[PDB]
Design an enzyme around this catalytic site. Structure first.
Site, mmCIF file in Angstrom:
data_model
loop_
_atom_site.group_PDB
_atom_site.id
_atom_site.type_symbol
_atom_site.label_atom_id
_atom_site.label_comp_id
_atom_site.label_asym_id
_atom_site.label_seq_id
_atom_site.Cartn_x
_atom_site.Cartn_y
_atom_site.Cartn_z
ATOM 1 N N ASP A 39 37.626 9.185 45.600
ATOM 2 C CA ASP A 39 38.442 10.414 45.890
ATOM 3 C C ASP A 39 38.521 12.066 45.703
ATOM 4 O OD1 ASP A 39 41.451 11.180 45.631
ATOM 5 O OD2 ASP A 39 41.618 10.475 43.522
ATOM 6 N N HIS A 69 42.792 15.493 42.348
ATOM 7 C CA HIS A 69 43.952 14.150 42.441
ATOM 8 C C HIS A 69 42.470 13.736 42.210
ATOM 9 C CE1 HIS A 69 45.269 10.897 44.576
ATOM 10 N NE2 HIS A 69 46.846 11.854 43.871
ATOM 11 N N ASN A 161 52.565 5.025 49.510
ATOM 12 C CA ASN A 161 53.483 6.298 49.256
ATOM 13 C C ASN A 161 54.234 5.738 50.042
ATOM 14 O OD1 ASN A 161 51.934 5.767 46.778
ATOM 15 N ND2 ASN A 161 51.212 7.889 47.170
ATOM 16 N N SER A 224 48.614 5.548 44.521
ATOM 17 C CA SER A 224 47.137 6.295 43.398
ATOM 18 C C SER A 224 46.920 6.741 42.004
ATOM 19 C CB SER A 224 47.114 7.721 44.462
ATOM 20 O OG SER A 224 48.113 7.777 45.325
#
Length: 279
Positions: A39, A69, A161, A224
């Site tokens: 990530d 994140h 998404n 995520s």
């Protein structure tokens, strides 16, 4: 064990019903498993990680998560308060820059890193990778996720998404890996969550409280954020010896809460990750 007033996601993964606020889980808690969080990197120094997080690889000037994140997702995996697997080892692979963007090459490199790097790590219970990222379809990205899987890493990937069929997104669309959809706390497919035949599971994805950069916390939404629940959950299940990497997705799907989610399009599995813990 029972963590009271837990994030709703955690409570949901240890429940048959929505609307509970206690996470229940065996105290082994993923001890002796590793999760690679591929990530934006991890703020290892967050007190929620209790020294169990470190950065192992970056493809940028810094290993520092300047985005948050990856730290968020690492916390959902295995932070003491917001994490599924509260004793797992977390390994940060920063394939994304601090704006959340990365080239596919770099992502691919990261995935292959993990596949080797795990042989430098002590994960007697097993290894998981949580890829909380995704762009448009790429067979090179898909095949990297597949190689990672084939190497005996349980790969969990975000469906995406886009509120689209995940077939068109990578690594979402690699069949061999665990593709995770997002659900919200009223047990609905999150409005944003991708769907389709390639989804394997849903996890909590709407309003997920976890760790953030600057020793802080925040709640954010995304498939995520669902992915690290499943990843944490695999780590947790592997530690319990319920499954290995190569079966963990199938196991999680076989033990999921079925038929509980609404707004699941026809053709998509109605499975919600469930730890099946009986206190």
């Amino acid at each position: 064990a029972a963590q009271t007033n837990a994030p709703w996601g955690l409570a949901r993964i240890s429940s048959t019903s929505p609307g509970t606020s206690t996470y229940y889980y065996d105290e082994s808690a993923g001890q002796g498993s590793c999760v690679y969080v591929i990530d934006t990197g991890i703020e290892a120094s967050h007190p929620e990680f209790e020294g169990r997080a470190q950065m192992v690889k970056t493809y940028y000037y810094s290993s520092r998560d300047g985005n948050g994140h990856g730290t968020h997702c690492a916390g959902t995996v295995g932070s003491r308060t917001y994490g599924v697997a509260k004793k797992t080892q977390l390994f940060g692979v920063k394939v994304l820059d601090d704006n959340g963007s990365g080239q596919y090459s770099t992502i691919i490199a990261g995935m292959d890193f993990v596949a080797s790097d795990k042989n430098n790590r002590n994960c007697p219970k097993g290894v998981v990778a949580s890829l909380s990222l995704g762009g448009g379809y790429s067979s090179s990205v898909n095949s990297a996720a597949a190689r990672l899987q084939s190497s005996g890493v349980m790969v969990a990937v975000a469906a995406g998404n886009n509120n689209a069929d995940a077939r068109n997104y990578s690594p979402a669309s690699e069949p061999s890996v665990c593709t995770v959809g997002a659900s919200d706390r009223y047990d609905r497919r999150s409005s944003f969550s991708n769907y389709g035949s390639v989804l394997d599971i849903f996890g909590p994805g709407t309003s997920i409280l976890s760790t953030w950069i600057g020793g802080s916390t925040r709640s954010i939404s995304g498939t995520s954020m669902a992915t690290p629940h499943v990843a944490g959950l695999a780590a947790y299940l592997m530690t319990l010896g319920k499954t290995t990497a190569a079966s963990a997705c199938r196991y999680i799907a076989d033990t999921a809460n079925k038929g509980d989610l609404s707004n699941i399009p026809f053709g998509t599995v109605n499975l919600l990750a469930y730890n099946n813990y009986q206190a």
